[PDB]
Nucleic acid binder design. Structure first.
Lengths: 146, 185, 180, 201, 103
RNA sequence: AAUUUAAUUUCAAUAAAGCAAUCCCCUGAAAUUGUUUUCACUUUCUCCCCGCACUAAUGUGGGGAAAACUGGCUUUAUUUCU
RNA sequence: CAUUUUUGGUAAGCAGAACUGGCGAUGAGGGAUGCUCCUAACGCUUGGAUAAGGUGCCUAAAUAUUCGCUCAUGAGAUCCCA
């Protein structure tokens, strides 16, 4: 037996919260020295604590943390429970999940923020000049529009 | 401490159910009942197409487990009410003086007269949605009926409380109005 | 490594014997593992056990060996069962608890925290009798059985927490418990 | 700290915490306009809070109640007395700190069109567990005889109609600005446009 | 527009208190968006200026100034101890102070 | 912000091979201290059967199989891919 | 007068002893408050780093982290010490 339009019903079943802490879910660390890193949830130790593991791409090593310090993202990889770091590197790159996060709004805002913080004196002036130019054109168009 | 607790509640044939963020609403043949649950943690999920309601709890404790059972039973009563109204049969008992039951105001306000010969009237207005009818059958029966399991019971309780005597042995003096039979219409 | 989540409980293997005399040419040699907050503390606890069980004190004996043990595979889960002897305000009790952890050391740290919380046991008042890793099918306590289920997952429902950088005293609108 | 006036929508705040946070800022020198105090929450069950307050009401000097402790029954003033407790008000610097604070129930007119802030540390939902009872200060105030709760509620409803009209206009205005901006974006020289684009503005 | 600041805003808190005892040698300063020990540490070597107004002229003008130096962070939450040439007058508690770019 | 050669059962990839299946590094439960032997322990986005959508679960309750993708080991090189 | 040892007395901020330390004659920091408790014994200053004790506000330090327990229609909260 299989589902044809009951498929649609299950699909638009709007659960009150998503993102279960199930193995292979993407997470943004909110607290401690490794805060601001992205990481995968590998294992679940106990009701409080989980084993998190960065990708070797994202660069925080395998370690136990309390669940309270993570903020889970939509995205998840299909990895086995057993998984260790080599298989994780091969898989994470292959299915391109980080790219999906970057394309997502919060990731996009994150990359803009990191640049904006790091921006040099010339760049800071440049944005002002461009914005000022934009204001001139925009104000002129509004004045025209009447 | 425990991770998951669940319960699965069938929905009868006639009901129109419609939950939303713990504001449960049931409509049916005999009127619409709304009954809030947003005081409670609970992941109520709806299932209109195939019927049934699923109550699921995350990270319960025995208090939470008790609550899940409480919510589901109460919801089932609401379905029962809209499908087929609750009839509470109340027999009016007297040893001596004949207790006079006058129903007015379109099956609202039962006025009770002559209790133990007191020559004074006891008026007990009903809850909204609550019919107070009299039986056609046995003379002292009085029907309290409605859609809401709570309101009919409270009306019955109010009637019962309103009547009974003071400062006489309650072993001996039995006169007053009592709940016989819990049924549906 | 994070200092905030750090603990200092380690396991030390201690071996000792009685000083030889005309009466005792070759003494009975004793070894034990002891869970301690440092090596000196490990020694002291071992000495107290020597006084309590055998006939010995620090003064008339000698340490043969002292070495730290550390977990072989600290990043794979184990189910540790522990048996304790403790003293209450009335008297003395034996008890058996189970802990999911990553090392013996982690298990003991949680256990001390638990014994303080549920029984008001101070560190002085606890005595470890045997801790061993127990198979999943043999677990005896319900909260550990629940974790051991085939496809463990659950929703997060803990409140947000975050750095001093963002934990500011004024905010644009009410933040949300919800999360996605 | 550094702004001229914080306006605080006290709705959903926990009494003590809101007071403590306000007091430190006042002492430092930041002006605080506390508004909409009736939906300040006190923690725990209603009956417990009423009983405790009833004992506070009961307390009076034997000699001459004119010089007895002032009771008050108005929610804003309750918050104010609590803030006074958390400042060294018999001192002169302290007296200035107490003066810096202004409190009112509902929202008066010059505060209508200024931004309300919320203090997230003192927000109820993030500090009281969800099976442990809680209590609205306005309700408490009505029970111990304030008798000005219905009127404030009527006023809140009126303000909301004004707010919704303003918001609808504003959202529409944001749309006009956004529409003009996207259209006149490609009237900018390439290099400047590219920098502006790079930081996503 | 004219005369843009080039200095970080600040608020003169108390003196370097302890409970019921007073030391006037050090002032405690909160700086505009500093909030942590680590963030505070960035300002440590920097010059401080307390500028204030008086009613009648001194050196022909209505403004005078006392000079100071940031000199160590204080607690976790980014407060700094500042040492001035002359003790800050305590009436200036909650007044504005300027943390300059130099040196 | 770092750093030297030690010491202390550390590790982990890399990319070519291989090895064993409730197997393996381990860890369980059993017959004056060694030591050996029994059977117990993995995955799964695999397949099958009953419950056929039965779930909190984009899946599932039970009952069976399958494999070595996954894990574990043995080799041979390799360390700025990590 | 305190610990500890201690005799009388129902007990006593009571009576009487033993050892030591105090207090008396001794400020200062802490114990909210205090002759005896804790810390520590004091020329005048500058900077440093702590003790005892704290770190929601009064009040200088954390609305710190981490695992527990706890709802009270007279909760509970700091040696001596109420």
């Amino acid at each position: 037996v299989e589902l044809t339009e009951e498929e649609l019903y299950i699909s638009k079943k709007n659960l009150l919260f998503k993102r279960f802490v199930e193995p292979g879910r993407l997470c943004l660390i909110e607290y401690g020295p490794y805060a601001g890193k992205l990481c995968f949830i590998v294992d679940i130790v106990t009701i409080t604590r989980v084993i998190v593991d960065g990708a070797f791409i994202t660069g925080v090593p395998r370690m136990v943390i309390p669940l309270k310090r993570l903020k889970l993202l939509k995205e998840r990889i299909k990895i086995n429970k057993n998984c260790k770091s080599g298989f994780l590197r091969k898989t994470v790159n292959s299915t391109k999940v980080l790219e999906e996060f970057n394309n997502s709004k919060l990731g996009k805002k994150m990359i803009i923020k990191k640049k904006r913080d790091e921006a040099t004196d010339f760049e800071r002036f440049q944005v002002y000049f461009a914005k000022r130019e934009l204001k001139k054109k925009m104000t002129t168009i509004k004045n025209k529009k009447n | 401490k425990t991770i998951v607790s669940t319960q699965k509640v069938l929905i009868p044939e006639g009901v129109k159910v419609a939950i939303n963020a713990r504001k449960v609403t049931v409509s049916g043949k005999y009127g619409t009942l709304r009954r809030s649950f947003r005081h409670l943690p609970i992941d109520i999920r709806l299932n209109k197409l195939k019927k049934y309601i699923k109550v699921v709890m995350w990270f319960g404790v025995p208090d939470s487990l008790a609550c899940i059972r409480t919510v589901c039973t109460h919801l089932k009563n609401m379905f029962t009410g809209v499908t087929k109204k609750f009839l509470y049969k109340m027999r009016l008992v007297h040893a001596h003086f004949p207790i006079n039951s006058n129903i007015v105001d379109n099956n609202t306000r039962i006025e009770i007269r002559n209790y133990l010969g007191e020559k004074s009237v006891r008026f007990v207005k009903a809850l909204p949605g609550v019919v107070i009818e009299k039986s056609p059958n046995v003379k002292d029966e009085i029907y309290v009926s409605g859609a809401d399991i709570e309101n009919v019971s409270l009306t019955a309780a109010l009637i019962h409380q309103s009547v009974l005597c003071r400062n006489k042995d309650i072993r001996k003096f039995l006169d007053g109005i009592y709940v016989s039979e819990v049924t549906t219409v | 490594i994070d200092n905030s989540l750090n603990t200092n409980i380690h396991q030390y293997h201690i071996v000792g014997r009685a000083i030889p005399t005309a009466k005792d040419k070759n003494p009975n040699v004793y070894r034990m593992c002891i869970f301690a907050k440092n090596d000196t503390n490990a020694k002291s606890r071992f000495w107290y056990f020597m006084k309590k069980i055998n006939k010995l004190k620090k003064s008339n004996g000698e340490l043969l060996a002292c070495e730290q043990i550390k977990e072989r595979f600290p990043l794979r889960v184990k189910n540790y069962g522990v048996l304790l002897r403790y003293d209450s305000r009335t008297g003395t009790h034996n008890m058996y608890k189970e802990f999911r952890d990553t090392t013996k050391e982690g298990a003991i740290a949680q256990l001390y925290s638990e014994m303080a919380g549920r029984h008001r046991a101070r560190a002085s008042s606890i005595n470890i009798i045997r801790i061993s890793e127990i198979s999943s099918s043999l677990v005896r306590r319900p909260h550990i059985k629940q974790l051991l289920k085939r496809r463990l997952r659950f929703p997060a429902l803990h409140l947000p927490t975050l750095q001093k950088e963002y934990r500011k005293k004024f905010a644009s609108k009410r933040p949300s418990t919800y999360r996605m | 700290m550094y702004k001229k006036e914080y306006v605080i929508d006290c709705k959903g705040h926990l009494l003590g915490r809101l007071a403590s946070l306000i007091a430190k800022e006042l002492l430092n020198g930041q002006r605080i306009v506390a508004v909409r105090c009736e939906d300040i929450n006190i923690s725990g069950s209603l009956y417990r809070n009423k009983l405790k307050y009833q004992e506070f009401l009961r307390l009076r000097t034997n000699t001459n109640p004119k010089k007895g402790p002032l009771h008050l029954r108005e929610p804003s003033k309750i918050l104010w007395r609590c803030v006074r407790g958390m400042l060294p008000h018999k001192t002169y610097k302290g007296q200035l700190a107490l003066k810096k604070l202004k409190v009112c129930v509902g929202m008066p007119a010059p505060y209508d069109k200024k931004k309300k802030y919320v203090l997230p540390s003192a927000l109820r939902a993030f500090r009281l567990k969800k099976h442990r009872r809680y209590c609205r200060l306005g309700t408490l105030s009505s029970r111990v005889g304030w008798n000005y709760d219905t009127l404030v509620k009527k006023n809140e409803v009126l303000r909301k109609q004004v707010s919704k009209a303003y918001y609808k206009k504003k959202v529409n205005n944001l749309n006009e600005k956004k529409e003009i901006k996207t259209e006149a974006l490609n009237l900018i020289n390439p290099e400047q446009r590219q920098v502006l684009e790079n930081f996503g503005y | 527009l004219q005369a843009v600041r080039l200095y970080e805003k600040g608020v003169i808190l108390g003196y370097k208190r302890s409970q019921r005892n007073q030391d006037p040698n050090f002032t405690l300063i909160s700086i505009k968006n500093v909030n942590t020990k680590k963030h505070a540490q960035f300002y440590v070597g920097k010059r401080v200026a307390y500028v204030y107004r008086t009613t009648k002229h001194h050196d022909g003008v209505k403004i005078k100034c006392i000079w100071g130096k940031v000199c160590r962070t204080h607690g976790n939450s980014g407060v700094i101890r500042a040492k001035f040439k002359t003790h800050i007058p305590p009436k200036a508690f909650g007044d504005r102070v300027r943390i300059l770019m130099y040196p």
